[PDB]
Design a protein around this motif. Structure first.
Motif, PDB file in Angstrom:
ATOM      1  N   UNK A 122       0.601  -1.145  -0.019  1.00 55.95           N
ATOM      2  CA  UNK A 122       0.100   0.200   0.132  1.00 55.95           C
ATOM      3  C   UNK A 122       0.812   1.192   0.103  1.00 55.95           C
ATOM      4  N   UNK A 123       0.666   2.073  -0.927  1.00 54.33           N
ATOM      5  CA  UNK A 123       1.195   3.459  -0.835  1.00 54.33           C
ATOM      6  C   UNK A 123       0.423   4.633  -0.374  1.00 54.33           C
ATOM      7  N   UNK A 124      -0.815   4.562  -0.317  1.00 55.62           N
ATOM      8  CA  UNK A 124      -1.801   5.686   0.191  1.00 55.62           C
ATOM      9  C   UNK A 124      -2.000   5.390   1.652  1.00 55.62           C
ATOM     10  N   UNK A 125      -2.574   6.392   2.164  1.00 48.79           N
ATOM     11  CA  UNK A 125      -2.968   6.295   3.445  1.00 48.79           C
ATOM     12  C   UNK A 125      -4.340   6.109   3.793  1.00 48.79           C
ATOM     13  N   UNK A 126      -4.868   5.534   2.826  1.00 41.40           N
ATOM     14  CA  UNK A 126      -6.407   4.992   2.985  1.00 41.40           C
ATOM     15  C   UNK A 126      -6.469   3.867   4.313  1.00 41.40           C
ATOM     16  N   UNK A 127      -5.558   3.185   4.556  1.00 42.14           N
ATOM     17  CA  UNK A 127      -5.744   2.362   5.618  1.00 42.14           C
ATOM     18  C   UNK A 127      -5.444   2.964   6.945  1.00 42.14           C
ATOM     19  N   UNK A 128      -4.395   3.870   7.196  1.00 45.89           N
ATOM     20  CA  UNK A 128      -4.674   4.680   8.338  1.00 45.89           C
ATOM     21  C   UNK A 128      -5.614   5.741   8.531  1.00 45.89           C
ATOM     22  N   UNK A 129      -5.942   6.382   7.433  1.00 45.53           N
ATOM     23  CA  UNK A 129      -6.963   7.335   7.473  1.00 45.53           C
ATOM     24  C   UNK A 129      -8.382   6.639   7.895  1.00 45.53           C
ATOM     25  N   UNK A 130      -8.585   5.442   7.321  1.00 44.20           N
ATOM     26  CA  UNK A 130      -9.793   4.719   7.849  1.00 44.20           C
ATOM     27  C   UNK A 130      -9.848   4.183   9.266  1.00 44.20           C
TER      28      UNK A 130
END
Length: 35
Positions: free
Chosen positions: A1-9
């Motif tokens: 994963x490159x985006x911060x979708x996981x952390x943001x979610x």
């Protein structure tokens, strides 16, 4: 994963859950004391 979708979610879910729990606890306390 490159985006911060996981952390943001995760952060979003934690904030909503925590806020809902805090409000529920406060309401329950104030409601119970109503007696």
């Amino acid at each position: 994963m490159e985006q911060s979708t996981e952390v943001l979610a995760a952060v979003i879910a934690g904030g909503v859950i925590g806020f809902l729990f805090a409000i529920f606890l406060i309401l329950l306390l104030v409601y119970r004391m109503r007696k």
